[PDB]
Amino acid sequence: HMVPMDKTLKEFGADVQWDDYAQLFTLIKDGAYVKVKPGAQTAIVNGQPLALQVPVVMKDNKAWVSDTFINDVFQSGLDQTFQVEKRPHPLNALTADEIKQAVEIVKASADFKPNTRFTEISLLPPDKEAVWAFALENKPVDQPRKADVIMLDGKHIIEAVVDLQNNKLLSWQPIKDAHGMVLLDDFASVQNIINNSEEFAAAVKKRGITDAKKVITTPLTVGYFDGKDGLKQDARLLKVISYLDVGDGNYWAHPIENLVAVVDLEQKKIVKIEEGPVVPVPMTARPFDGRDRVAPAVKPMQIIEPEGKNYTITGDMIHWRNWDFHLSMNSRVGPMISTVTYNDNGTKRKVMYEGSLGGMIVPYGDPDIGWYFKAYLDSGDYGMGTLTSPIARGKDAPSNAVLLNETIADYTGVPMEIPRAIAVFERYAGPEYKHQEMGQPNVSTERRELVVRWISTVGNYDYIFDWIFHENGTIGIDAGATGIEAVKGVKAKTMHDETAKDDTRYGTLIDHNIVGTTHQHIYNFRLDLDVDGENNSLVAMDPVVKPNTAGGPRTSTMQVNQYNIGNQQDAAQKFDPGTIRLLSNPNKENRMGNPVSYQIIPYAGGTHPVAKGAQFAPDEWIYHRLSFMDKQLWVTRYHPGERFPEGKYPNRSTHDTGLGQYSKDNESLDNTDAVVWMTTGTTHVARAEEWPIMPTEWVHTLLKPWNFFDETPTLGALKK
């Protein structure tokens, strides 16, 4: 029984190329590079021959394969990219079965109710010392596996801990005052509640909208204003902004300006409609999907690895050159990079226990009724892992990437497999080093980087995060932003109209009747670096110009002021990119007697203007609630429950329960387990080039080995 080759291979997600001159198919998926000729008894997979019982059959210019071809070829074993894990790593995420088990254990208590949802079901952090002992010594972890299960019972948060080995509930703790994140069903509830409101339909009608069934809602968290917003603190509320669907696939281009509904999600009712002046809806079609555009005819470019990859993925463990690390997915913050070591001539040296996104915020700058409260805490309030955007193969990542599927719990407690959740890819990155000595043979080597890429979309914006492993020990973390801008409906068509100056006070006029309201993008990364060990110190090195006291003609010299930063409050600081900040191991030295260190660079560049802090006065509630926005470098003492720069429950928070709190007390940062937090931000002033869709803009951060090694790390293995 035969199937059409071209169609079957495309369903499966393989690239299929036919070469009529060579009479050769080239088939590519992930780590498999396959060559096969019609009628041939053998195919080639990653340079190795594979017998085929049934050859590819060509027949009236149409290829047909066996029913078993895809499994015979792609799952043969000749693609060595993925390997089976011997003993399960203790940081492996919860499996589908473990998720279902956690949900049965809590559903077996008297307290569970059928409206009860799950904000997060995740592995409970096992003991760090034990996890490192498993990674470095293969010591089994004796403590049993547990899950944190965070429930939303109507509006109340409850934290449960389940023991998975012994199948029992270990704790069940109500968290008073905490509001829950926004859950997927809240999007539909809001849209339904608005569709059923007579009051809302009348409001919409007086702003020009004839058909209220064409109104698209979007849910926003309301923040906290100590009652100036007129919103009761006890209630589960969301604000709702509206747009008109005109059939262009881009409702974001048709704001219904100055109409905000406040929805109570327990009562399932609109509890308040805020109405400002009437601004006609911008109606012109502004598709971003190409429906109105001519297709480009570009010549092909492929990045090919025809003998397979240089990395191996064993369960969730990635091995690549001198690097080893574990890669898992969390529903709130997305990818977690753990137990990162560097193999230095046979000895695995610790670099990082856990790194991930801490949290992020996109706060707006306009005081009007549709805007004043508007701030996306994308991970904390919406769940960025849950909103992972599957990688578009060859576009969102290069043609030579491997795309990983990842499993998390949805809000009803059912496993969901996110397809193409993460891309892994090696890339050429210019020369690693070069020296052309005059009159001698050249010396050049190529640089290779391993990239781990993940994309999450929250409403209008799409965020790309790259964790970049350099062969030489450097680690990069880059954050990219694309998607559709949040825009304000205005009366001005051009800057010559009467209202233009007022309409553009808080943002640029980027289309007729459309203003891209000014805002910031602020990302924070939590990096539990363990620089060649647990016990580290924060060291400052400030390059300075000093008077020359040594004689000769110079008046000045270049020197460095070096000092330790021994307490947390002083560690929380602005980053001057002219200075050097190290996390050093004062217990271990390189061959020159210098403490082995990593240099921390929270700002290594970007393509939008940089935020030097929060673009808010210090008496703003958002400023008070979210200290992480205003400093670029923080260092705190390791604590397994201090994970989020915005705090665990940021929705309508009244005070800072994140980095403001974690860095508040002054215990010592001297020779102890430190956690580094980097904040990097931009100030986004809009331009017409960014509308109707924004070209990807990037910010860059770096961690560089600083006397961690004894010489150029990529020179190669010593032959004597």
Distance CA 567, CA 669 (A): 5
Asked if 670 is part of the footprint of Ca ion (rule: CB under 5 A), the reply reads no
Least CB distance to a second copy at residue 403 (A): 13
**510 scored as a contact of a second copy (CB under 8 A):** yes
Backbone angles phi, psi at 102, to 5 degrees: -60, -40
* Cα–Cα nearest to 571, from 435, 699, 709, 664: 664
Does 110 bind a second copy (CB under 8 A)? Our answer is no
> In this chain, which stretch among 51-59, 87-95, 664-672, 677-685 interacts with Cu ion, using CB under 5 A?
677-685
Judge residue 2's burial from the number of C-beta atoms within 10 Å of its C-beta, 0-12 exposed, 13-18 middle, 19 or more buried.
middle
Stretch that binds a second copy, among 92-100, 328-336, 523-531, 545-553 (CB under 8 A): 545-553
Q: Residue 673 touches which of a second copy, Ca ion, Cu ion, none (CB < 5 to 8 A by kind)? A: Ca ion
Nearer to a second copy, 233 or 712 (CB): 712
**How many whole angstroms separate alpha carbon 136 and alpha carbon 90?**
13
Q: Which of 38, 125, 390, 566 binds a second copy (CB under 8 A)?
A: 390
Write down the catalytic residue from 324, 378, 381, 656.
378
**Among 488, 581, 684, 704, interactor with Cu ion by CB under 5 A:** 684
Identify the residue among 229, 528, 646, 656 touching Ca ion (CB under 5 A): 528
Nearest to Ca ion by Cβ — which residue?
530
Give the one entry of Ca ion, Cu ion, a second copy, none that residue 528 binds, where binding means its C-beta sits below a cut-off of 5 to 8 angstroms depending on kind: Ca ion
Terminal alpha carbon distance of the chain? 60
Strand partners, 130: none
Amino acid of residue 241: I
Q: What angle do CA 682, 688, 693 make, to 5 degrees?
A: 75
Catalytic residue list contains 243: no
- Only segment of 124-132, 270-278, 618-626, 681-689 that touches Cu ion (CB under 5 A): 681-689
The reply to whether 461 belongs to the active site is yes
Question: Per CB under 5 A, does 530 bind Ca ion?
Answer: yes
Give SS3 for 464. Answer: strand
Q: Which residues contact 578 (CB under 8 A, 6 or more apart)?
A: 543
Residue type, 580: I
- Show contacts with a second copy in window 335-374 (CB under 8 A): 364-369, 372-373
Contacts (CB under 8 A) with a second copy, residues 673-692: 683, 685, 687-692
Among 1, 59, 555, 641, binds a second copy (CB under 8 A): 555
Query: According to the binding rule CB under 5 A, does residue 453 interact with Cu ion?
Result: no
Closest C-alpha among 225, 292, 299 to residue 262: 225
- Which residues in the 604-643 window bind a second copy by CB under 8 A? 604-607, 609-612, 615-617, 619-621
> Which residues 298-357 are close enough to bind Cu ion by CB under 5 A?
none
Q: Which does 658 bind (CB under 5 to 8 A by kind): a second copy, Ca ion, Cu ion, none?
A: none
Closest to Ca ion by CB, 354 or 378: 354
Q: Identify the residue among 159, 410, 432, 673 touching Ca ion (CB under 5 A).
A: 673
Task: Please answer whether residues 83 and 49 qualify as being in contact, where contact means their C-beta atoms are separated by less than 8 angstroms.
Answer: no
Q: What letter does residue 388 receive in the DSSP assignment?
A: B
Q: Which does 365 bind (CB under 5 to 8 A by kind): Ca ion, a second copy, Cu ion, none?
A: a second copy
Find the catalytic residue in 243, 311, 382, 461. Answer: 461
Q: For residue 12, with 0-12 CB atoms within 10 Å meaning exposed, 13-18 middle and 19 or more buried, which class applies?
A: middle
The backbone torsions φ and ψ at residue 568, rounded to the nearest 5 degrees and listed phi first, read -60, -40
Is there binding between residue 625 and Cu ion (CB under 5 A)?
A: no
Residue 530 contact partner, candidates a second copy, Cu ion, Ca ion, none, CB within 5 to 8 A by sort of partner:
Ca ion
**Secondary structure of 17-73 in the HEC alphabet?**
EEECCCCEEEEEECCEEEEECCCCCEEEECCEEEECCCCCEECCCCEEEECCHHHHH
Q: Which of 645, 693, 361 is nearest to 519 (CA)?
A: 361
In the complex, what is the shortest distance from the CB of residue 228 to a second copy, in angstroms, rounded to a whole number? 4
**Looking at 506, 628, 634, 649, which residue binds a second copy (CB under 8 A)?**
506
- Interface map 449-488 toward a second copy (x if CB under 8 A): ------x-x-xx-x-x-------xx------x-xxx----
Q: Strand, coil or helix: what is 425?
A: strand
> Phi/psi class of residue 583: alpha, beta or left (left: φ > 0; alpha: ψ in -120 to 50)?
beta
Catalytic residues, by residue number, are: 378, 461
Residues binding Ca ion (CB under 5 A): 528, 530, 673-674
